[PDB]
Amino acid sequence: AVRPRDHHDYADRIALSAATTDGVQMRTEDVRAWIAERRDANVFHVERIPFADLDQWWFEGVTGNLVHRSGRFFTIEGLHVIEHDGPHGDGPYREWQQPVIRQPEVGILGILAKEFDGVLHFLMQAKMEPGNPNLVQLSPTVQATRSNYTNVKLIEYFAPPDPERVIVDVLQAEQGSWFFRKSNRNMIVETVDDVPLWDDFCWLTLGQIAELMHEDETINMNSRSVLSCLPYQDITPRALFSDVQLLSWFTNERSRHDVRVRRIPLADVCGWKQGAEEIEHEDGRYFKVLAVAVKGSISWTQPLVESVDLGVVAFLVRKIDGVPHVLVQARVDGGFLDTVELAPTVQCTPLNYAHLPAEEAPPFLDLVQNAPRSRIRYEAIHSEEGGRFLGVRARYLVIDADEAIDPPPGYAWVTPAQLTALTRHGHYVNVEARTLLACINAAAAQPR
Amino acid sequence: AVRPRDHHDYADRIALSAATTDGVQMRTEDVRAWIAERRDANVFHVERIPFADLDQWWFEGVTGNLVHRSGRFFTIEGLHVIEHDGPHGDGPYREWQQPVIRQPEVGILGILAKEFDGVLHFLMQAKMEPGNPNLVQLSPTVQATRSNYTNVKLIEYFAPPDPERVIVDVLQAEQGSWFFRKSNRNMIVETVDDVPLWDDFCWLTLGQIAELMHEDETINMNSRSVLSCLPYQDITPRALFSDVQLLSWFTNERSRHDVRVRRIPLADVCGWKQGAEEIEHEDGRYFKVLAVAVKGSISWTQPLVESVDLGVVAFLVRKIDGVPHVLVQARVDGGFLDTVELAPTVQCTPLNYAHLPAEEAPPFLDLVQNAPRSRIRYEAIHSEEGGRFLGVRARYLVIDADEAIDPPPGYAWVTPAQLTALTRHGHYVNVEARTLLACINAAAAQPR
Numbered sequence: 001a002v003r004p005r006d007h008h009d010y011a012d013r014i015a016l017s018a019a020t021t022d023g024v025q026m027r028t029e030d031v032r033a034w035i036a037e038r039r040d041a042n043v044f045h046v047e048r049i050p051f052a053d054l055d056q057w058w059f060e061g062v063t064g065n066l067v068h069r070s071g072r073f074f075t076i077e078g079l080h081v082i083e084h085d086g087p088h089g090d091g092p093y094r095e096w097q098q099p100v101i102r103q104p105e106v107g108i109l110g111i112l113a114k115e116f117d118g119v120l121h122f123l124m125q126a127k128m129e130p131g132n133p134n135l136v137q138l139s140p141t142v143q144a145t146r147s148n149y150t151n152v153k154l155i156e157y158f159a160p161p162d163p164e165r166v167i168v169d170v171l172q173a174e175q176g177s178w179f180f181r182k183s184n185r186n187m188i189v190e191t192v193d194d195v196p197l198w199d200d201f202c203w204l205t206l207g208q209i210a211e212l213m214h215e216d217e218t219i220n221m222n223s224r225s226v227l228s229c230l231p232y233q234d235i236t237p238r239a240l241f242s243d244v245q246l247l248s249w250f251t252n253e254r255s256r257h258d259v260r261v262r263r264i265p266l267a268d269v270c271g272w273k274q275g276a277e278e279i280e281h282e283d284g285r286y287f288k289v290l291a292v293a294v295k296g297s298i299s300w301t302q303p304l305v306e307s308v309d310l311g312v313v314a315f316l317v318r319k320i321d322g323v324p325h326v327l328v329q330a331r332v333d334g335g336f337l338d339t340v341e342l343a344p345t346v347q348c349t350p351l352n353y354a355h356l357p358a359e360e361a362p363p364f365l366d367l368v369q370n371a372p373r374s375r376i377r378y379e380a381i382h383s384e385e386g387g388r389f390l391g392v393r394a395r396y397l398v399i400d401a402d403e404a405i406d407p408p409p410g411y412a413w414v415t416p417a418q419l420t421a422l423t424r425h426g427h428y429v430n431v432e433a434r435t436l437l438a439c440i441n442a443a444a445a446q447p448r
Numbered sequence: 449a450v451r452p453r454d455h456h457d458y459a460d461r462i463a464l465s466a467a468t469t470d471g472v473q474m475r476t477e478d479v480r481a482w483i484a485e486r487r488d489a490n491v492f493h494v495e496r497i498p499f500a501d502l503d504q505w506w507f508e509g510v511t512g513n514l515v516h517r518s519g520r521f522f523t524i525e526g527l528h529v530i531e532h533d534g535p536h537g538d539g540p541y542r543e544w545q546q547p548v549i550r551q552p553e554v555g556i557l558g559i560l561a562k563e564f565d566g567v568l569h570f571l572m573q574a575k576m577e578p579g580n581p582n583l584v585q586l587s588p589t590v591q592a593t594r595s596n597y598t599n600v601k602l603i604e605y606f607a608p609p610d611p612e613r614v615i616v617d618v619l620q621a622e623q624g625s626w627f628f629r630k631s632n633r634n635m636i637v638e639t640v641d642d643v644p645l646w647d648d649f650c651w652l653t654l655g656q657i658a659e660l661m662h663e664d665e666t667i668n669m670n671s672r673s674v675l676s677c678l679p680y681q682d683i684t685p686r687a688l689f690s691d692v693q694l695l696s697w698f699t700n701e702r703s704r705h706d707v708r709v710r711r712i713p714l715a716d717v718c719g720w721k722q723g724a725e726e727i728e729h730e731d732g733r734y735f736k737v738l739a740v741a742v743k744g745s746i747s748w749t750q751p752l753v754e755s756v757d758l759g760v761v762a763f764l765v766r767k768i769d770g771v772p773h774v775l776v777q778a779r780v781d782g783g784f785l786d787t788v789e790l791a792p793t794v795q796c797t798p799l800n801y802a803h804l805p806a807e808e809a810p811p812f813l814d815l816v817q818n819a820p821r822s823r824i825r826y827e828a829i830h831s832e833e834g835g836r837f838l839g840v841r842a843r844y845l846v847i848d849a850d851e852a853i854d855p856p857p858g859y860a861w862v863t864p865a866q867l868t869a870l871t872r873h874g875h876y877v878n879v880e881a882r883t884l885l886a887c888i889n890a891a892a893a894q895p896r
């Protein structure tokens with residue numbers, strides 16, 4: 001039995017859910033209380049601890065890599081990157097070494113969807129992670145690397161998914177500054193079954209999620225990544241680049257740099273000092289590796305990575321003949337698999353550039369940091385994955401560009417719909433850009 | 449000025465060219481003579497030579513890697529692969545070390561197109577390569593890694609291409625058994641300019657190329673790779689998997705293996721012996737590294753890689769509700785960037801399996817090797833890139849599967865149109881499958 005190649009398009013159902021803020025389970029204004037109710041339901045204290053007091057983690061002796069004795073979860077290893085300016089690369093030349101998080105197994109980031117009263121809802125999970133600054137945020141229905149579990153609720157809907165019910169299934173990369181070539185499987189799958197409901201789960205329409213997306217530190221990094229992959233229909237199907245032209249532009253960005261990376265032992269990393277409490281850069285930039293104990297009120301100890309300052313991640317937006325475009329950058333990070341990924345107009349931790357002249361600041365940073373309320377279309381503070389990162393936060397913005405811009409090398413005007421289409425594939429849209437696409441789609445569905 | 453996202457579709461022009469065998473420059477039956485005329489035009493002798501007699505190549509002392517003293521062209525290094533069966537990978541367990549070709553710079557494989565008498569033609573190049581078994585085959589208009597040239601004819605049409613004239617621009621990977629993560633930029637670009645014509649170039653319609661594609665050792669590996677990317681319109685837009693279902697199936701294949709690879713010094717490779725003339729495997733499988741001198745009648749010396757036997761590469765085909773599907777395999781090779789790529793139903797050098805029991809032969813090999821003329825839809829012998837490979841040939845087949853098959857794990861029925869659509873992106877379709885897609889598209893346009 002063959003079917004049409006575009007069989008079972010969910011675009012109309014997705015649209016109806018995004019337009020609806022009346023959900024079956026909970027009023028949107030009550031979710032904040034529900035989260036607090038879940039946070040209070042078992043108190044966790046996360047305390048920073050010397051590395052020596054890590055329980056089942058150690059620095060293994062030959063490599064000095066920070067590893068869990070069972071061989072599960074992740075490792076902290078070393079990375080050496082060179083970008084050449086020579087031939088076969090445009091440069092400029094860059095070279096550095098750093099600690100890096102490694103985790104070779106693809107994990108599942110799965111959102112279960114089901115219709116109630118004729119409107120799709122999505123089963124969000126109130127999930128405690130040790131590095132969440134507010135402890136509990138809303139994660140996907142299933143957020144798990146399977147072999148980290150000797151028992152994950154609802155995992156069977158994603159392992160394998162029913163192929164008749166897949167809305168989204170794609171691998172997408174995570175932060176290329178701090179993880180070495182990490183991607184997880186982003187999935188949205190429908191069911192008609194009665195689904196068991198545990199206290200930590202709430203069915204929400206996409207319109208309820210769109211409102212919640214404007215709130216700080218509420219919808220977690222993994223939820224924003226998976227929701228960014230939703231295949232909306234394009235309402236304005238024109239763009240400055242045709243889709244082939246955009247693929248060609250990006251092909252040239254991925255071909256024009258000469259980046260060589262190698263994984264090295266953590267003990268070999270130059271420029272970083274390993275103390276009794278932290279591994280930190282010698283000039284206090286970038287991030288630190290630290291250790292925490294997690295106690296309930298169940299317990300464990302683990303490394304986490306913390307950044308040195310609040311980050312700034314922004315898209316500049318311009319309407320071109322009436323069609324909104326965002327200015328992407330084809331960014332070259334050390335942990336990327338295929339040299340480049342598209343990223344927001346500005347993506348940086350500003351302190352990392354404070355030592356350099358104003359003209360080596362990230363392009364457009366000044367413009368974003370000093371923008372008027374009137375040009376700010378979206379602003380919120382979101383944090384990164386709390387299983388690996390301790391309180392790593394950034395101001396995520398969408399700002400109208402007050403005047404035309406000639407994009408500098410490495411930048412291009414692309415529509416959000418073109419970004420939505422590329423999320424069918426991996427290594428095109430980076431995690432920060434995926435978060436801002438989820439924010440743009442939320443602002444469109446439920447504006448404030 | 450925005451344009452429609454699907455602006456400037458070339459599908460009707462491509463179709464008209466594929467239907468036309470009356471070309472402006474040459475009758476198709478005369479091309480064989482023209483090639484011989486170009487071969488005779490300057491005779492080259494390629495002779496095998498001991499490694500010692502390599503001129504500007506050496507085994508560098510710390511690594512033992514085979515390198516050109518100028519730092520251009522490619523290197524032969526070592527590779528160590530493990531596939532784990534543990535947990536986080538399906539297995540089975542595999543582990544081996546081998547020499548491998550490395551060349552980090554993306555090269556250009558560019559075909560220039562232009563209308564004559566209202567029909568697109570493509571400017572093919574009669575190109576001598578030292579490893580071509582018959583010396584001269586038809587390559588793309590531009591076939592060059594730019595920094596290997598201190599001066600490449602027509603390169604300016606591809607560097608950068610005119611964005612208003614791009615038909616195809618995409619990176620595609622080469623053999624994952626013998627190259628380490630190598631992709632080149634496959635491009636087809638139109639011009640309305642009068643183009644200079646040198647004696648080694650001939651304008652051909654796509655229908656002329658389709659006829660030439662049925663000939664042995666005529667249209668070279670790089671030309672078949674780039675022509676496989678042509679975006680034909682789908683005449684039958686149904687398939688067993690919807691396009692999302694196919695992406696989901698492939699996502700699970702790319703997530704379910706645990707492959708770890710590292711580049712090592714050639715001197716460290718176990719299981720291979722380096723002699724005065726060849727590096728070869730201790731049990732005489734796989735390939736050898738050898739050295740050749742190339743003399744005109746201009747000269748140089750270089751390594752080449754030769755395989756141990758004629759290869760067999762085949763698609764099995766079945767009509768499913770009237771729609772032809774081919775049985776792809778999601779193949780796991782050591783040089784791939786992203787774990788898997790789709791490959792033909794059968795892709796092997798049979799001698800590499802002669803030591804193992806009949807039940808560890810590649811699935812379907814027996815069926816392909818013993819197929820009836822009546823079930824053979826396409827058969828030809830094609831060789832691989834003659835700049836790196838000495839006489840590496842395989843029988844490329846498309847065969848009707850005499851009965852339904854339940855695909856084994858790692859295999860799936862996909863339509864050729866779905867493969868054509870995935871060639872807009874890299875790392876989905878491997879080079880052997882791209883060659884068979886070009887052959888399927890040739891058999892459809894100009895059947896024999």
Ligand SMILES: Cc1cn([C@H]2C[C@H](O)[C@@H](COP(=O)(O)OP(=O)(O)O[C@H]3O[C@@H](C)[C@H](O)[C@@H](O)[C@H]3O)O2)c(=O)[nH]c1=O
Nearest residue numbers: 094096097098175177286311312313347348349352394
């Ligand atoms: C980590 C590191 C970086 N570098 C170089 C690499 C880069 O060229 C430059 C900036 O480093 P990056 O890690 O790319 O930081 P950045 O400030 O440019 O970007 C950051 O943006 C925040 C919004 C994100 O949350 C972070 O994950 C990161 O992407 O410094 C070093 O020289 N040494 C180092 O140890």
Ligand SMILES: Cc1cn([C@H]2C[C@H](O)[C@@H](COP(=O)(O)OP(=O)(O)O[C@H]3O[C@@H](C)[C@H](O)[C@@H](O)[C@H]3O)O2)c(=O)[nH]c1=O
Nearest residue numbers: 542544545546623625734759760761795796797800842
């Ligand atoms: C090279 C090598 C391979 N192996 C293992 C890896 C694979 O599991 C198995 C088969 O090796 P492969 O190189 O994949 O050979 P193969 O015979 O399976 O496939 C070949 O098909 C021909 C049509 C292509 O032209 C070749 O480039 C290659 O892909 O042997 C070793 O154990 N040692 C080695 O040195």
Ligand SMILES: Cc1cn([C@H]2C[C@H](O)[C@@H](COP(=O)(O)OP(=O)(O)O[C@H]3O[C@H](C)[C@H](O)[C@H](O)[C@H]3O)O2)c(=O)[nH]c1=O
Nearest residue numbers: 073107108109143144145148184300301302385387388
């Ligand atoms: C790190 C650690 C944990 N635990 C426990 C605590 C957790 O409850 C459980 C699993 O923990 P983790 O969430 O770290 O493992 P996963 O649920 O697999 O989540 C990871 O993978 C996902 C797919 C997402 O990417 C997620 O963001 C990522 O963190 O194991 C330890 O006992 N000791 C330890 O050292």
Ligand SMILES: Cc1cn([C@H]2C[C@H](O)[C@@H](COP(=O)(O)OP(=O)(O)O[C@H]3O[C@H](C)[C@H](O)[C@H](O)[C@H]3O)O2)c(=O)[nH]c1=O
Nearest residue numbers: 521555556557591592593596632748749750833835836
């Ligand atoms: C290898 C060698 C060559 N030459 C000369 C001979 C050639 O005429 C010229 C360039 O040669 P090559 O074709 O090897 O280099 P490219 O034209 O860059 O072709 C390579 O890259 C392409 C994009 C295609 O992938 C092609 O298949 C691939 O081979 O340089 C040497 O003088 N000494 C030597 O060691």
